Design a binder for this molecule. Structure first.
Ligand SMILES: CCC[C@@H]1OCC(CO)=C1C(=O)O
Ligand SMILES: CCC[C@@H]1OCC(CO)=C1C(=O)O
Lengths: 187, 187
């Protein structure tokens, strides 16, 4: 039988390609192999399905940061590698593409989706605090401000890449912007 | 009688507050003082009205850059002051707020709106080229890349500010990000 993750992947594919309005639970059930009633057991409405997709595209990242940390990357290199991985994931992964598209549509999706930006901001602030204490971060740079700036800039870069080029050029666009941001952050 | 600009301002107010779907020509006509048939003389459909709002929120900026240039600001200070003025304008001006909201909604507005980002990218590239030739721009920084990075980062900053805080904190959010970007751009 199909798992929650399998249903979520199918839902992600459809939301990424069609948006919330154009997606249906009927089409998710067909894609994934099961009846609508069976899907509703896992996700009782289209709204709850959308929420689960957005939540998942955030909740995955703490574990990634832990994987990087235990390899001994410095605080600022940890932030860099997280954003590298995010860029590849928006490029490739339907759950990320769907999470972003659902959040793009938030003003006209009647569903209580998680607040954008704040999870990644909170996530990155921690290594950025360590970077400050360590002497890695340029004097006067506030870690909370750096976290906000990085998340907003990265968000904007990936959004532009999506809107204009379906994220095909995302890695180059991130490289050129990251070079400036990290030049400004490094002591 | 009402001018095109007056109709466009009323339309902007409604689009900014309600989005494209929730806006109507009927409500624009009521707001501005005139019959729907009289409004349709200027803008034959809701689509053409939306296009005019988005086009206007871009077309205004070349003149602003000229006003700054003739005061003798350096190439990089010209870029800085343009983005300062953009931040205040998104904060305050319904036409800017509407332009951004209509572009946010572009994937589900059936209207041929102008491509986002490219006008501002082209606009800023010119002074950034001058900055390079002048020796103002850090060695190795490509002007076209800097223009893209600045537009995407600024876009993201203002979007986050809108989504979370209705742009109330936009000037502070821009200051902290601009400090990093321009630290990285200046020779
Ligand atoms: C560092 C990822 C920033 C990010 O990009 C898309 C998106 C979806 O709203 C984001 C978020 O909410 O944090
Ligand atoms: C420097 C302004 C960047 C900008 O912010 C909102 C928006 C609307 O799509 C933008 C654009 O298209 O260039």
């Amino acid at each position: 039988i199909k798992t929650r993750a399998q249903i979520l992947e199918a839902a992600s594919e459809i939301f990424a390609s069609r948006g919330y309005r154009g997606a249906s639970v009927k089409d998710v059930a067909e894609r994934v192999g099961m009846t609508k009633g069976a899907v509703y057991f896992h996700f009782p409405s289209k709204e709850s399905l959308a929420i689960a997709v957005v939540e998942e595209h955030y909740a995955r990242w703490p574990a990634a940061m832990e994987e990087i940390r235990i390899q001994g990357f410095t605080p600022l290199e940890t932030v860099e590698e997280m954003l590298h991985r995010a860029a590849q994931a928006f490029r490739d992964d339907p759950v990320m593409q769907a999470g972003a598209r659902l959040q793009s549509e938030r003003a006209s999706i009647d569903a209580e989706l998680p607040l954008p930006y704040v999870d990644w901001t909170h996530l990155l602030e921690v290594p950025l605090q360590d970077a400050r204490e360590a002497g890695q971060l340029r004097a006067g740079v506030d870690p909370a401000a750096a976290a906000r700036s990085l998340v907003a800039a990265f968000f904007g870069m990936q959004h532009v890449s999506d809107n204009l080029h379906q994220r095909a050029d995302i890695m180059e666009r991130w490289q050129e912007l990251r070079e400036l941001m990290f030049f400004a952050l490094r002591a």
